A paper describes a structure:
In order to determine how SUFU interacts with GLI transcription factors, we attempted to co-crystallize MBP-SUFU-FL and MBP-SUFU-Δ with GLI1p as well as corresponding peptides from human GLI2 (GLI2p; residues 267–283) and GLI3 (GLI3p; residues 328–344). Despite extensive screening, these attempts were unsuccessful. Therefore, the residues WLG61–63 of SUFU were mutated to DSF in MBP-SUFU-Δ to disrupt crystal contacts between a loop within the SUFU N-terminal domain and residues in the C-terminal domain previously implicated in GLI binding. Furthermore, another flexible loop in SUFU was shortened and residues 216 and 220 in the MBP moiety were mutated to histidine in order to promote metal ion-mediated crystallization of the fusion protein. Peptide modelled into this density forms a β-strand clamped between the two domains, creating one continuous 13-strand β-sheet spanning both domains. Upon GLI binding, SUFU undergoes a large conformational change in which the N- and C-terminal domains come together to clamp highly conserved GLI residues in the middle of a large β-sheet. In contrast, the structures of our SUFU–GLI peptide complexes show that both the N- and C-terminal halves of SUFU interact simultaneously with a major evolutionarily conserved SUFU-binding motif, including the amino acids SYGH, within the N-­terminal half of GLI. The following serine (conserved except in Xenopus and Ciona) is hydrogen bonded to Glu376. In agreement with these observations, a GLI3 peptide that terminates at His336 (GLI3p-SHC; residues 328–336) is unable to protect MBP-SUFU-FL from deuteration in HDX experiments (data not shown). Moreover, the tight packing of the leucine next to the histidine in GLI with SUFU residues, coupled with the importance of this leucine in the protection of SUFU from deuteration, strongly suggest that the minimal SUFU binding motif in GLI encompasses the amino acids SYGHL.
Residue numbers in the entry:
A (entry chain A): 1 to 617, 627 to 714, 718 to 740, 748 to 753
B (entry chain E): 333 to 340
Amino acid sequence: MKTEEGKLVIWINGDKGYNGLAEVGKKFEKDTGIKVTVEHPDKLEEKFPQVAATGDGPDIIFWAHDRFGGYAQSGLLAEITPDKAFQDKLYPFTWDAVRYNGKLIAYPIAVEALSLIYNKDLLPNPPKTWEEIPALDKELKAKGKSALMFNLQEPYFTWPLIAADGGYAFKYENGKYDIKDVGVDNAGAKAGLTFLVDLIKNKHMNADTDYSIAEHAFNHGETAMTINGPWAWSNIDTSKVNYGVTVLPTFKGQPSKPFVGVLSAGINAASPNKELAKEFLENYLLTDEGLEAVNKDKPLGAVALKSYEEELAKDPRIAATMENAQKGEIMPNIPQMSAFWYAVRTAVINAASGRQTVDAALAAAQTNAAAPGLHAIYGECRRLYPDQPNPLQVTAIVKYDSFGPDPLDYVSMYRNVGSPSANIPEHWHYISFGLSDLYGDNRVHEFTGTDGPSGFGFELTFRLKRETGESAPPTWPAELMQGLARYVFQSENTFCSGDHVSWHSPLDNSESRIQHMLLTEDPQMQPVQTPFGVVTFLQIVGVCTEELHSAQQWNGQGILELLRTVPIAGGPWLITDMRRGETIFEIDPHLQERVDKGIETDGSNLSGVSAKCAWDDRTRQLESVHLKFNQESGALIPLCLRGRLLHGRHFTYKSITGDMAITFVSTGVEGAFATEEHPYAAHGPWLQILLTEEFVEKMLEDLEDAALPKEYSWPEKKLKVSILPDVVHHHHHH
Amino acid sequence: SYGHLSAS
Ligand SMILES: OC[C@H]1O[C@H](O[C@H]2[C@H](O)[C@@H](O)[C@@H](O)O[C@@H]2CO)[C@H](O)[C@@H](O)[C@@H]1O
Ligand SMILES: [Zn+2]
């Protein structure tokens, strides 16, 4: 039982008639006593799903219908249950628009479509074609004016042109959408966007033009035309500009196809006020007086409510709205629409800016829209960088699924301001895409469904100290990441925090002393759930050979902590400074003593290493054994023996090329199948050999590396160090 | 706890 009064929090976009809605709420409060608070937060379509998870979202959310299926699929919307009479009061197509999986998930409010708006004084006869506009602009330019200005930051406004010659979102056939058939990279879409980019190239439009600039331009009479919706008209009236609303220009002898939106009001599933919300929406808003109150503030367009529609249908602006809505298509409401919108937004901005060609932009958008794992990761990125919607990205020209050299399809580069209070410097943040399962169609990775690791289950990241004067992030770390990715795919070994990676060249191909890498959990990036699995984020940390050796001999985690305690060497977020000239040991002499104390008392943390090695003469015992290593692995043999066997621990060399492994074991440890009685044993290519403390000590005495090939022998066994005979191949995760 | 050598 509830002994309390409810309330209503309402979200509506800032370009809509929210004061009129507040007036309808004021009337609701008068009649009912229930307060109604109308808010118009920025990015409310992105915030709503964020806040609903906290339980702090509104009772009612207004938006175009295309977003609501995603919210619904995510369980964020209450099913709406109007009786037949009320359903009868609104047009069937709009109910259709607000229908998801056989349920009504919102109340439809109004039909929106873009139209050509034009200044009758500057232009008494508006152009019937897009092709006319460049010529018209020159004329208007002669007298200090422009032909057309509109919002190029939202793909919504450019889409009518893109769709004109045959661009589409998802193909509608036999009552449903095909989520893999996307029409953004077809000739018609390329043609439309190419036309837009040509308009910008020839200086008839500017790529940076946004909503407010276009609005100011048209409302001050600085531009002859604009493209906008009904909501925009109230402000034009105020400007006292003599304007007309007409059909959008044709492209290639075809009508522009704007996406038709139905302004809809959904009820939060977590709301304790669903009835008050129903009452408000049905009996107060969706009436002549309510919609009139909202429309007076900012025109809604063609309202779903018949009575007010016949009343507003007289308006030739609404007639024009409906002509353009008619010639266009209603937006799908399927969940994949937000990924699709992100994809198209980036393509239009990048093509218009000249950052990318139309072909590359739309190809990425086409692939991008069909890509859930990517969209999940991008989601995390967006959470981290609200300020940077469009990052600089390194894109693989030929993708890995077609056997291009680079397995990371994309590498995003962000500018991270760090924390000046925390003494964390500014730096560039690289994030990779490809080691996880982006697309889930098994082109590169095996798809097993939700839960478990997505692809290898992680993505690589890197933090590079920003140098003074640097306008953009350097791109070499991307190639570095590609190298690491190539290793991961070929070797089949997943990376873990605490691991090290011997590279043996300065990472940036400079003279830098940073020639090696440690791997740790990214300090900011949180693991993500994708339909294809979970993704964690492994940050790369550049180190000196001395530090690598210390990580090997002692442990990686310790060295990482030391690196955190020394800011110029990493700090809390373990940022890499390629120009760093001293090891942490040169910075604090005594610290080395701490490692040395650690090594002698605790030994090495390294369970094993992947290296060039082999062994030779179904569980099998062997009378003789012959072990083979390369120099580097050979240099770790002393670590294996002294560092672990003498501490009652085991050590494993695993070959990356073959399926072989060699595990050194000492007396005890239970788990070993190698007994002193039978020293050498093998489970296939896995070889386990048991060595005694006495023999370990003796072995340590014998080994002092010398020129190759170098040979060691005993009556039972031989040990070779070789010049990389070890040679000749796995692709993908198939 | 693991080492990967000469990944290049
Ligand atoms: O730009 C992509 C954007 O398009 C639509 O948003 C429209 C909205 O429908 C209108 O009511 C008005 O606010 O203009 C918006 C474009 O700025 C989609 O509804 C939306 O999901 C999408 O992000
Ligand atoms: Zn394959």
